[PDB]
Amino acid sequence: HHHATNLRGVMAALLTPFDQQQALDKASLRRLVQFNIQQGIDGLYVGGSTGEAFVQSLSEREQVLEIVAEEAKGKIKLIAHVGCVSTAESQQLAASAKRYGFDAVSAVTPFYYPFSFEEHCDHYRAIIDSADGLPMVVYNIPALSGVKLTLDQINTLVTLPGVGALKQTSGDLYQMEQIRREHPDLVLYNGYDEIFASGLLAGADGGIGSTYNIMGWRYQGIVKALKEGDIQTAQKLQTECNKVIDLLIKTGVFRGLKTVLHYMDVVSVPLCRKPFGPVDEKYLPELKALAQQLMQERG
Amino acid sequence: ATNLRGVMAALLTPFDQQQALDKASLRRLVQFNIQQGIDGLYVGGSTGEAFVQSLSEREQVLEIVAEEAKGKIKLIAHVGCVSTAESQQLAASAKRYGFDAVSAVTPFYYPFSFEEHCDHYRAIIDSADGLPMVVYNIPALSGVKLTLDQINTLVTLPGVGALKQTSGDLYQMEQIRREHPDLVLYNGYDEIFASGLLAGADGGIGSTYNIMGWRYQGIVKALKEGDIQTAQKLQTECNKVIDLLIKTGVFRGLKTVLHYMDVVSVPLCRKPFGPVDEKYLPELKALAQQLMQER
Amino acid sequence: NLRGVMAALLTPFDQQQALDKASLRRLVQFNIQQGIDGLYVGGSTGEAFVQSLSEREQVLEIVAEEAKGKIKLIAHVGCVSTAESQQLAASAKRYGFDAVSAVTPFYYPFSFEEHCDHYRAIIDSADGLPMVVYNIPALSGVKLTLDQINTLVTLPGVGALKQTSGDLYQMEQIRREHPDLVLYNGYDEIFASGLLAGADGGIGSTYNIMGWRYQGIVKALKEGDIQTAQKLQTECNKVIDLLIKTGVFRGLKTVLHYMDVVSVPLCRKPFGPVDEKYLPELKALAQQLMQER
Amino acid sequence: ATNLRGVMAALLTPFDQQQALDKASLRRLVQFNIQQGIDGLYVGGSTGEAFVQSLSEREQVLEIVAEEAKGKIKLIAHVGCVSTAESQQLAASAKRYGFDAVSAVTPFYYPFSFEEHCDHYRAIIDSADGLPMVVYNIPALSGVKLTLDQINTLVTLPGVGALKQTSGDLYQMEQIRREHPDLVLYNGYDEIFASGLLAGADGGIGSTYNIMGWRYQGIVKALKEGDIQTAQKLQTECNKVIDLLIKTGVFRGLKTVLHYMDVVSVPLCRKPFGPVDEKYLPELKALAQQLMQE
């Protein structure tokens, strides 16, 4: 619990680049990992939902995990999202994660089927087992999983021996604050980017997100401002993030960020995997507009 | 409507053993919010148990409070009912009693269209005869689930002045604040106050304010001179209290505390609300001594 | 005797949104002739939650003058407030009603225990009338569990469940668990299915236009005329499609306008009027419905 | 696709204690389904624990089923994954084992535009290569809240000859049937099967049919002659079991009953499904004996 103090920070949810055939664009991936590190991001959360995990294989996921150890180990933090519906698939990646040098593992509450809470804790323990002492980030996302944990349940999920943090992809800051109060040293990752500033105020000590792949820096400043006690530009940074977040809801959060990064020239093909479609044409104007904008406010 | 910007207590409505309006306690509770340091009042809301009162009851409360408080603070009158005609009767009555504004929850139970909602609000803003209207939004209890634009359109309606945002979505809070720079934006849920501010609210209307509304102005102060640590500490001490209220049942809890603060005489809510569980009293009893000693 | 096809009465208003007594009366009659086993008085469909207690009492009385000893009359006295529900109940007794009803009190979060008392007080104030416990999650948000349902349908004084839920598994667990219990289908649109899983009746809105069509669904099922039921239900749903699109209450009131029963087809504000463009179909529908019976 | 009409068992996938596919108990469970009265089997669906298998495992299951059942009865391959191409791979495979029908769940987890679903269902029809498709809808587990128009646009995509309707909204079932007199219409919730047939459904695909598909076939029958009273008794007894199988957990519960009837060797579901509770064994045991006789 205390051992996980380091896992604190702003961590990007790495996208997975794909080629004209839907295959892993291995080259574009390699670039993106850099694009991220030169932004000054604290760490990368690899193979999560943003990372398109669920339209890939145990193998394909493992290539990414690997192709990212070669690059980003030692320098920044690496959390490996090893989560599948199957517990055994999860432990395969947890051990592949231990192998490849990773700093922590993480798993989405398994989904589609309605598992009990006892079943949920057994899923997690077994992935920790196979983690061979790597920290666990329990990954909580009701919107998309369909899972609905009480407070007490969530309290129990994070005091399992080997649990080090919480991805809280939830909009409830009453709960976010209740979690802090309860576990005063827990590493509490804000998960919805549209409310980072707000989540930090309730007891977060960092976050994870997908938008960082194109404007990471904005999020670090918000942390700085709060440390400082400068409530004013903190809100300027939240506010500008959501004008981008606003547009990435309109286009498609993944195919938007990728159709951006194609303009920043870090992706040969901005595609997501089927069944996800191509971005609609008329956004290209503004998408082209946003890459062009974002490159200059950094440099 | 900067006059409306503020920490407004959602006034509770006192009853007696026989479930009758307790006007002694109404008046005291009104004074105990003045002396406490509140910017204003929001009378006859959900928190005031509006929907277990008759119109005549909601009128006698309005009248008393303007009697005790007009000129002394801002007063908003929640005049909302499911019926437009009931709602207008109360708008007229609020205007009569000298109120600064009126408010009305989205009308509920039956499905109404968004056009029908707006006409509801047009009709009310009119019987209100010049009072500016606070649109009242509480989706979890109303069951009305408004989009963003729809909410942009309700707030530009003729003679709408403010939005009570009783929502937990601090993304939508920002999108309103960023799209209506001037708008008086009230935070609804007491437990995200600090963060609702950050997201872009300029104040709040809240039920627990009735017992520790300094702690929420104390939140506002703390945030304005960048003392995050006192602010978070407050919210935290607010939620500590909100955790107990959520367990005891919030209105009856809140009243039972004022019953130990000697303000309210019978700590009842109306049937079918029940009494507070006898087991919770020492914790409420000593929340009050605790709280009386902080003020 | 509470068992049957029991039409949820609409409250016809005049051009000033006041109780159109003549039409009210014309609708009691216009229903009475359809075969309907009874009329459900002052429920949601009766626009009750946009009337004062007086106006609701006004209806209970008028109707009970047009109807008592002829058909079954059920009085929905439910408000959010227990005291107010109690009043409408004692009235329903005075006017000599067959049963009272009371939808789970809504808006505020009440405990199931708190609910239970609500009904205990209303069963006392109805002074020996039986209660129709009136479930409706969609509109009230009250999300009842089977176990909670089980105690409520066996509170001493209660005698029936208005099961306004499209969950036909739960219908059967209830028929199973209380084999005698009277239990009304609430969705007009799954009535056929609902008797199949074990409702033995319906309290419904759209019965005000076609009680017989529903009655003849009950016939066919009873008579194993499975082909018939469907045919009917399908024509009973081709309307419900229409009415859902029109505005339902207004839709029905209008149809009763083009049937010469209701002088002015209006609901109270905030329900506005029926769009103009849907008047032809409603008129055609009206003039297709008088043909049958 | 009128030939696809009927009561189909949603096939369970037997596993051993290593969580490896138990191939001798698969074939047995297939033979037990055939011997039982079934019109056909629906393979590697949610009931088949699809979403905890790999593509390989899903393919090896199918193969065993088509070796054992093709010709004899009707065969539907649930080839649905989140990814279109994985569905596409399972699709062609499904055709190599000479299946009658292909199926796929509306892709889940990520929110997909309706358009993006329609294409997905086309790409799988292409690969199905002449095998009809069974649009499989199940809002409760998928979180995909399809409307009426949307659904009508699906089931008229060219190639689609069935809808699996695992939605408990029997008004929607009538609208779909009123609009589509010839569409095969599989009831998906076993606990409202009678009521769903009355609403429109002419077929069924379900998990409980693995232990009492004859009861379900009798409902179709009972109904069609106009014997409501037995349809009723049947559905009420079908429902008595589901009460049971919900308490224990449904797949494992069923795997247990199936174990007692000498069909499945090890009644395990793949983690994170837990084992069934020891306390429920008496009654689960007791249910098997009841059903073998009946």
Side-chain angles (χ1 to χ4, degrees):
Chain A
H1 217 274
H2 310 265
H3 315 271
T5 301
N6 60 359
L7 289 175
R8 187 181 290 144
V10 167
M11 326 260 166
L14 188 69
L15 301 175
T16 303
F18 304 120
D19 69 24
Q20 254 297 109
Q21 280 76 28
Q22 307 262 329
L24 315 192
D25 193 336
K26 301 207 156 207
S28 298
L29 170 57
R30 294 182 169 287
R31 289 170 263 182
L32 172 51
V33 191
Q34 292 325 296
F35 200 95
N36 268 271
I37 67 101
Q38 289 134 48
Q39 295 176 344
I41 192 59
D42 311 351
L44 286 215
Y45 181 89
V46 187
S49 29
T50 319
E52 280 140 304
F54 310 115
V55 295
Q56 281 197 101
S57 71
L58 265 42
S59 171
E60 280 167 342
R61 284 171 69 161
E62 277 177 347
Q63 312 188 6
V64 172
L65 279 181
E66 190 193 22
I67 285 154
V68 176
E70 288 171 352
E71 310 257 26
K73 196 201 135 174
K75 302 184 172 190
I76 69 184
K77 296 272 172 173
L78 300 174
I79 295 137
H81 165 79
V82 294
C84 307
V85 190
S86 159
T87 304
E89 290 180 351
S90 297
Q91 292 167 302
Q92 170 161 355
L93 301 163
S96 295
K98 174 62 190 165
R99 264 211 297 295
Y100 299 140
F102 274 71
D103 300 294
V105 285
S106 170
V108 54
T109 60
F111 51 83
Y112 187 93
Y113 302 110
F115 306 113
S116 66
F117 187 60
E118 184 178 7
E119 288 169 343
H120 271 120
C121 311
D122 278 332
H123 183 79
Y124 277 101
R125 292 175 191 105
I127 298 156
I128 295 155
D129 185 71
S130 289
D132 214 7
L134 258 37
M136 167 60 70
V137 192
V138 175
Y139 172 14
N140 183 196
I141 184 175
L144 285 191
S145 64
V147 178
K148 304 173 168 59
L149 303 137
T150 60
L151 191 96
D152 285 330
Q153 286 180 338
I154 278 162
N155 284 352
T156 291
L157 258 201
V158 289
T159 50
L160 290 177
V163 161
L166 191 71
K167 212 184 160 183
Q168 177 84 139
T169 301
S170 140
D172 183 355
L173 300 179
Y174 180 23
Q175 191 172 85
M176 183 72 87
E177 182 283 342
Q178 281 181 138
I179 290 173
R180 171 50 68 219
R181 187 146 27 99
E182 205 40 37
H183 310 120
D185 344 283
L186 178 66
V187 157
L188 207 38
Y189 302 109
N190 175 101
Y192 277 123
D193 296 351
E194 69 270 46
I195 75 180
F196 192 106
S198 273
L200 277 202
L201 185 56
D205 58 15
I208 305 182
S210 63
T211 57
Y212 309 3
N213 283 241
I214 75 164
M215 77 203 184
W217 60 93
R218 287 177 189 182
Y219 296 92
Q220 185 44 1
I222 289 149
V223 181
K224 196 195 177 284
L226 283 169
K227 196 185 185 203
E228 289 167 338
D230 178 27
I231 293 189
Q232 301 179 0
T233 195
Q235 300 157 323
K236 229 292 211 317
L237 296 166
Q238 204 53 81
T239 307
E240 302 286 310
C241 281
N242 300 173
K243 313 181 190 174
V244 173
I245 291 177
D246 275 2
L247 189 57
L248 294 168
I249 285 198
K250 283 152 56 194
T251 47
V253 173
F254 308 152
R255 62 194 171 172
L257 291 146
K258 288 210 206 157
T259 296
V260 156
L261 291 152
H262 182 215
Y263 292 124
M264 297 161 184
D265 282 67
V266 197
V267 179
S268 308
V269 187
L271 256 153
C272 295
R273 270 199 171 148
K274 297 314 190 215
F276 286 127
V279 182
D280 203 285
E281 299 257 11
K282 48 144 176 186
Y283 297 88
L284 291 155
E286 324 189 30
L287 293 160
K288 169 144 183 179
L290 190 50
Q292 288 191 323
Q293 176 178 20
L294 268 147
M295 293 179 253
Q296 285 168 349
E297 30 188 288
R298 148 208 191 79
Chain B
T2 192
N3 33 315
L4 302 182
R5 209 137 319 181
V7 182
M8 316 300 191
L11 201 72
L12 297 166
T13 301
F15 307 111
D16 69 49
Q17 188 66 68
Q18 271 71 65
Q19 292 227 297
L21 288 169
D22 188 322
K23 304 177 188 163
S25 316
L26 168 57
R27 301 181 178 276
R28 278 192 216 79
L29 184 47
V30 169
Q31 282 321 310
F32 180 70
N33 271 265
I34 298 147
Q35 276 143 79
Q36 175 173 71
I38 199 65
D39 292 305
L41 287 179
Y42 187 84
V43 191
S46 305
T47 325
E49 300 181 52
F51 314 115
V52 280
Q53 280 165 101
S54 67
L55 297 189
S56 193
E57 280 165 350
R58 295 171 70 173
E59 282 163 350
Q60 302 157 59
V61 180
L62 296 173
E63 190 185 5
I64 289 172
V65 174
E67 249 158 62
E68 293 280 310
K70 177 155 188 291
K72 314 213 199 144
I73 61 220
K74 280 341 171 282
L75 317 156
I76 297 165
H78 173 79
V79 303
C81 306
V82 174
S83 152
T84 302
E86 281 189 335
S87 297
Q88 291 169 111
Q89 171 182 158
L90 291 181
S93 300
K95 168 56 140 133
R96 288 212 307 288
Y97 305 131
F99 264 76
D100 300 295
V102 293
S103 204
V105 77
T106 54
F108 53 90
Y109 188 96
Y110 303 110
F112 298 122
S113 57
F114 181 61
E115 167 175 332
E116 287 168 347
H117 275 99
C118 285
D119 286 348
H120 185 73
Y121 276 118
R122 272 155 184 145
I124 298 165
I125 279 168
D126 193 281
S127 310
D129 193 20
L131 281 69
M133 153 78 47
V134 180
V135 145
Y136 181 178
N137 174 213
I138 191 160
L141 291 194
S142 79
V144 184
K145 328 217 193 114
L146 295 165
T147 72
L148 179 81
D149 329 317
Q150 287 184 350
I151 288 195
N152 297 331
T153 294
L154 272 185
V155 301
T156 45
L157 268 204
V160 171
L163 178 48
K164 195 182 179 196
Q165 180 69 148
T166 303
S167 186
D169 178 349
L170 298 181
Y171 171 37
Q172 204 182 67
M173 187 76 80
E174 181 275 330
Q175 289 167 125
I176 294 155
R177 169 58 66 237
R178 155 162 54 103
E179 168 78 24
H180 297 104
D182 289 281
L183 156 76
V184 169
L185 191 52
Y186 295 100
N187 189 83
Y189 283 115
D190 292 9
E191 51 271 31
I192 66 182
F193 186 73
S195 304
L197 284 160
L198 209 59
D202 52 55
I205 297 145
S207 45
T208 62
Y209 296 15
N210 289 277
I211 68 155
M212 77 215 177
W214 69 85
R215 284 184 187 174
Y216 295 92
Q217 275 154 327
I219 292 205
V220 166
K221 190 189 162 178
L223 289 190
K224 259 186 251 164
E225 340 123 320
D227 188 355
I228 287 159
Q229 280 68 192
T230 289
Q232 305 172 312
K233 195 252 213 276
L234 289 157
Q235 193 64 74
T236 301
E237 295 290 311
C238 280
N239 296 180
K240 277 191 179 192
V241 163
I242 297 174
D243 290 334
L244 178 46
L245 295 164
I246 282 176
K247 266 196 81 178
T248 71
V250 184
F251 305 153
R252 64 183 153 219
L254 279 181
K255 291 180 163 170
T256 308
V257 158
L258 304 141
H259 175 206
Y260 298 119
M261 300 182 179
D262 269 272
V263 179
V264 181
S265 315
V266 161
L268 280 165
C269 297
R270 278 187 166 178
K271 300 308 192 157
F273 279 105
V276 184
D277 210 357
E278 279 165 321
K279 59 174 182 159
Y280 299 120
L281 292 196
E283 216 171 339
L284 296 144
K285 183 181 301 201
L287 180 57
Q289 268 135 8
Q290 173 186 18
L291 277 190
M292 303 172 340
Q293 274 189 297
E294 195 187 329
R295 180 177 166 269
Chain C
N1 35 3
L2 296 172
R3 214 164 293 206
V5 182
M6 305 291 235
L9 198 57
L10 292 143
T11 301
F13 303 121
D14 70 34
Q15 175 73 350
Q16 264 60 51
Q17 318 225 319
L19 312 193
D20 178 324
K21 299 154 155 199
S23 292
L24 189 54
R25 282 185 194 288
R26 249 185 282 160
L27 190 76
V28 175
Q29 299 320 154
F30 181 81
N31 279 280
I32 275 169
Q33 315 135 36
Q34 287 169 299
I36 223 56
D37 297 338
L39 299 158
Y40 190 70
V41 194
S44 348
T45 297
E47 255 167 288
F49 305 119
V50 296
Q51 293 177 96
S52 74
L53 304 195
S54 195
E55 301 191 312
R56 279 167 81 166
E57 288 176 319
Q58 204 177 152
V59 172
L60 289 172
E61 193 181 66
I62 284 168
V63 144
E65 284 169 4
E66 298 296 293
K68 183 181 128 191
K70 281 157 209 159
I71 73 199
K72 295 283 153 184
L73 302 182
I74 298 171
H76 174 97
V77 306
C79 312
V80 169
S81 156
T82 300
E84 283 175 11
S85 290
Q86 315 205 66
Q87 201 206 69
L88 297 182
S91 291
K93 178 93 176 162
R94 283 200 309 277
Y95 317 149
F97 266 79
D98 289 310
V100 293
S101 203
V103 57
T104 46
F106 48 99
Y107 200 83
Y108 305 103
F110 301 107
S111 69
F112 164 76
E113 294 188 291
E114 280 171 335
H115 286 101
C116 268
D117 275 30
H118 193 74
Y119 286 107
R120 277 181 191 145
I122 296 155
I123 260 160
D124 193 42
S125 282
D127 208 342
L129 264 34
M131 171 73 64
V132 175
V133 167
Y134 178 174
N135 185 219
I136 182 170
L139 304 190
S140 64
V142 173
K143 304 228 141 48
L144 286 182
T145 76
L146 169 59
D147 266 304
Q148 292 173 339
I149 266 177
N150 291 306
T151 308
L152 277 176
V153 326
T154 51
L155 288 167
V158 182
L161 191 90
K162 198 181 144 181
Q163 174 76 138
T164 323
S165 144
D167 179 9
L168 288 209
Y169 176 24
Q170 194 193 48
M171 192 70 70
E172 191 287 337
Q173 290 169 282
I174 299 175
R175 173 55 77 211
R176 185 108 51 70
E177 177 49 65
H178 308 94
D180 298 314
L181 170 61
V182 162
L183 170 63
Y184 310 90
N185 189 83
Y187 299 90
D188 300 0
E189 73 270 6
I190 73 154
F191 189 68
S193 296
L195 307 183
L196 208 61
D200 63 3
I203 294 172
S205 87
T206 74
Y207 304 3
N208 290 282
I209 63 180
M210 46 220 194
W212 77 93
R213 282 199 186 182
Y214 287 89
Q215 288 287 22
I217 289 167
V218 186
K219 183 164 196 282
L221 295 178
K222 220 163 265 189
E223 277 170 11
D225 260 346
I226 203 180
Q227 270 284 339
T228 308
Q230 262 142 9
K231 168 202 176 307
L232 304 176
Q233 188 65 67
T234 326
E235 298 284 312
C236 275
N237 290 167
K238 281 154 174 196
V239 169
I240 295 188
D241 289 10
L242 188 53
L243 289 179
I244 279 178
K245 251 191 318 195
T246 75
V248 177
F249 300 164
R250 51 190 188 227
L252 299 158
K253 273 179 166 179
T254 292
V255 150
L256 296 152
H257 175 255
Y258 288 146
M259 268 179 168
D260 286 71
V261 175
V262 168
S263 312
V264 190
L266 271 187
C267 288
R268 274 175 170 179
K269 296 288 207 178
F271 285 117
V274 178
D275 185 324
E276 292 267 24
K277 69 205 204 178
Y278 290 135
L279 291 160
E281 289 154 292
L282 274 152
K283 166 137 212 142
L285 165 51
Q287 266 195 42
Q288 198 272 301
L289 273 198
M290 291 178 282
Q291 320 289 37
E292 284 184 46
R293 183 70 62 197
Chain D
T2 143
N3 45 4
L4 301 159
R5 182 159 280 125
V7 180
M8 320 289 195
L11 198 60
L12 292 161
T13 292
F15 296 123
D16 67 20
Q17 187 100 41
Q18 278 45 78
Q19 309 279 44
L21 296 171
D22 174 346
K23 294 198 159 165
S25 307
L26 175 55
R27 299 193 174 86
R28 201 168 298 129
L29 182 70
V30 173
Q31 301 301 351
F32 180 70
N33 275 293
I34 307 172
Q35 286 174 25
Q36 223 182 280
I38 213 71
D39 294 313
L41 287 166
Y42 180 89
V43 189
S46 337
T47 302
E49 263 161 298
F51 316 108
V52 291
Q53 298 175 60
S54 62
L55 295 210
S56 192
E57 291 170 354
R58 291 173 69 176
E59 274 163 324
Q60 291 166 47
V61 166
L62 304 175
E63 193 166 34
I64 289 165
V65 179
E67 299 191 318
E68 299 276 300
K70 175 177 159 204
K72 299 174 206 209
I73 61 189
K74 301 262 178 257
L75 291 169
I76 321 184
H78 172 81
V79 309
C81 308
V82 166
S83 150
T84 307
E86 288 176 340
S87 295
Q88 281 204 302
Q89 188 195 306
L90 294 185
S93 301
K95 169 89 174 188
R96 303 182 221 113
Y97 315 149
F99 269 77
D100 300 326
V102 309
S103 191
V105 70
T106 71
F108 56 85
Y109 196 95
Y110 294 121
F112 292 108
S113 103
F114 185 69
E115 181 69 53
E116 284 166 331
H117 286 140
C118 285
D119 280 3
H120 178 93
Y121 279 99
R122 275 158 203 150
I124 293 157
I125 284 157
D126 184 344
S127 307
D129 218 331
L131 276 65
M133 158 79 80
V134 183
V135 161
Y136 174 20
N137 164 249
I138 183 186
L141 311 188
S142 73
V144 176
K145 341 189 105 93
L146 286 177
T147 74
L148 178 50
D149 299 329
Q150 284 170 336
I151 280 165
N152 293 311
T153 302
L154 281 171
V155 322
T156 62
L157 286 179
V160 179
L163 171 71
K164 192 170 157 199
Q165 180 81 150
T166 311
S167 153
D169 179 3
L170 300 199
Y171 170 39
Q172 191 171 84
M173 178 86 60
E174 174 285 315
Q175 289 172 143
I176 293 159
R177 169 54 78 234
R178 163 151 41 87
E179 186 68 14
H180 290 123
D182 306 317
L183 181 89
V184 170
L185 201 43
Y186 296 124
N187 190 74
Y189 278 119
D190 294 9
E191 56 273 6
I192 66 191
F193 186 71
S195 303
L197 291 161
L198 185 65
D202 55 12
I205 288 172
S207 69
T208 57
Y209 309 178
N210 292 286
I211 68 168
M212 59 210 174
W214 71 86
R215 296 178 168 184
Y216 292 99
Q217 291 282 40
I219 277 151
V220 167
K221 176 169 208 260
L223 275 179
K224 250 200 222 148
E225 279 141 17
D227 175 10
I228 274 131
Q229 200 75 101
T230 302
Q232 247 141 20
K233 196 202 201 331
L234 289 172
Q235 187 61 73
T236 285
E237 292 309 312
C238 285
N239 280 210
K240 285 199 183 180
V241 169
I242 294 150
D243 294 345
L244 202 52
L245 292 163
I246 281 162
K247 294 193 304 201
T248 56
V250 173
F251 306 153
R252 60 188 180 209
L254 279 162
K255 280 186 156 172
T256 307
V257 186
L258 274 170
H259 180 244
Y260 286 124
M261 307 170 101
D262 293 351
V263 185
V264 168
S265 313
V266 189
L268 280 191
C269 288
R270 278 195 176 175
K271 290 285 170 209
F273 285 105
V276 154
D277 211 74
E278 293 226 4
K279 94 150 274 305
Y280 289 109
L281 282 165
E283 307 162 69
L284 274 156
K285 160 153 266 155
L287 174 55
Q289 274 147 30
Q290 159 166 28
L291 271 176
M292 285 177 290
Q293 188 84 42
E294 205 233 289

